[PDB]
Amino acid sequence: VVNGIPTRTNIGWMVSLRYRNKHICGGSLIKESWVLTARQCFPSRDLKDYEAWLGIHDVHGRGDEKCKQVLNVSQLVYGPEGSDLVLMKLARPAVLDDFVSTIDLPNYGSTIPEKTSCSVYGWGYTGLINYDGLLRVAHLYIMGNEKCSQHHRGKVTLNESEICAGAEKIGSGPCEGDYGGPLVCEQHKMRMVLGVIVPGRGCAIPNRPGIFVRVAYYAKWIHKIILT
Amino acid sequence: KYQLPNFTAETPIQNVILHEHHIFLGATNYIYVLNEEDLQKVAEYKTGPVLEHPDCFPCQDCSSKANLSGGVWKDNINMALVVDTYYDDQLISCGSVNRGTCQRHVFPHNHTADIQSEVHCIFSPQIEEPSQCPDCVVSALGAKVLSSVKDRFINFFVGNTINSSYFPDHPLHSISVRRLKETKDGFMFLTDQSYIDVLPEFRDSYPIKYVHAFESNNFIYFLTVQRETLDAQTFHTRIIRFCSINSGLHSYMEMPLECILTKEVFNILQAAYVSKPGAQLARQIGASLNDDILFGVFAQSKPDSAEPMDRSAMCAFPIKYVNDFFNKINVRCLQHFYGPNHEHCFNRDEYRTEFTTALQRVDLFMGQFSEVLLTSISTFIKGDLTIANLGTSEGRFMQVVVSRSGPSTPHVNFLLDSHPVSPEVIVEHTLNQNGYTLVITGKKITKIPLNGLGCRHFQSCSQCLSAPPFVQCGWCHDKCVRSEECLSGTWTQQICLPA
Structure with a gap:
């Protein structure tokens, strides 16, 4: 920024989306299994290449061993034609401590x-x-x-x-x-x-x-x- | 001998853009700015002769090596020129010279001829994959660049002829798609699927000229001249089509195109314009008043070559049919990108498909032009009529009517500067169906009106009343012209007074 x-x-709601291992995009955690994000965030279609890190402060997770949660992405649901919205399903809910909130x-x-x-x-x-x-x-x-x-x-x-x-x-x-x-x-x-x-x-x-x-x-x- | 708005530069003109009432010529070592209205030069910017070096890197400049141990001084041919207007209005230009590396000129918020005051070179240093070079856009030995906004990103689709000068860490790609960064300081390739490259082995064997590109109907199209097959003697024009996406080149397919005399084939496309038809032509070729058609001016090959003989024919492909031919249910595999051998090719986003048969269409001029080399085409509607604007290696510029039914002869025909006519052309309309073409000849750009002209050469009332009716000339006291363009209250198509 x-x-x-x-x-x-x-x-708490902050999610870093990572394509091929480096960070690429932000995301708001809106429910235990759902990150709301933008469409311009997915170069691949293969969801193998992605990973969602939760409850971090350092883009590289440097401070945050005791809070980090990394989740694989299970689904992409693109929103209506106009929008650049896409809803990301993660393969297992995020667990909500104080560091992870919706x-x-x-x-x-x-x-x-x-x-x-x-x-x-x-x-x-x-x-x-x-x-x-x-x-x-x-x-x-x-x-x-x-x-x-x-x-x-x-x-x-x-x-x-x-x-x-x-x-x-x-x-x-x-x-x-x-x-x-x-x-x-x-x-x-x-x-x-x-x-x-x-x-x-x-x-x-x-x-x-x-x-x-x-x-x-x-x-x-x-x-x-x-x-x- | 006609008298027209006539700008002449001191160096050859590669490329041309019209923006906010100014004209931007992209020239050898130069960019010019002319006034749309009278073609007077308002401003220059010197991309001027530049020094090549192994040590001198691509966005940093040097008289700090001018004394040279193994460095050559080089002419900066303009390869691309794009005005962008999604971001703050800017001229983006891409020279041949520093490994094909574009710069942006940012217009100040009122002076539009100011190519000069704020100009940034575009080359962000490469750190994740130091092998790639996404700021190396254009190829010194032939490029076509087409830029379009998509998904809130400025996207660049780019055809590049490529020649196996194995450049360590700055390669070029044959076709590719990259976007600008919103930080405006670098292009990026979205994934490894965003370029398709001639295989290193054939990178020389022989190459792929890129004649034209355009976006229509949500695909990007390239027009191309290349190798009926690899190490296979004879040449050939194809279309290349792929889905309009940032994310990579998606439904990629090259399909051959054939122009014939009626088989007498014109296998070397020379220039091409894309426009809607007028009703007369429409009816005739498959129609749709509101359809995109590819007008292509072709030429016959000198046997076993790619160089063109002085034999021309033009013929028109509605892109709607192009697609049908691409879509419908046979199909080879991309011999120059995959191996001729190995997987994918022995099989059947993912796959890259060559076609084995051309989409053929016949000369619309019926040989009217089978003894000259047409080098430039452009197209417009007048009421029901569809009109070609043609250009020739001999320097001749001429306006013809396009038709199957009717073997029409040009109503305008004359000499522009002895240097050939350039395929790079501009048409711009103005209210009530006139406007003008800008037409480059060696190093001169001329502003030929679309309409009045076919009257100006009648030196006498009688003769003028005798002109082809569609041209709609009349007699204005002493001159010959159409009504709107006539001063006084007189004007006929019927009466000559005792002069």
């Missing part, structure tokens, strides 16, 4: 008020000479799409299935290696995954918000896949 800071400790999800129709504060999380690119490998977090506020369209200056027009968050006046935000990661907000009381990181039109461009995928738009579908 460009222009964010190290997370104090590790984060994130909540929105109700199907729900909105979010503007300037609702949020975070993106990731082990993707930080433009640093030597990234120490720890999870990074960048804070954004939710922008409306209507303004978000005008900030991107006519280049993009957002579907009711896309959602925006930016930081005021500066460049920060997710990037290569961050995708599939959660944009997480909170309002009601607790924490919900509200957008899913997908590739942008440039990382941390000063004063141009990030567009994420509205999970709310897809919650029905997600539930009918994960609830069982």
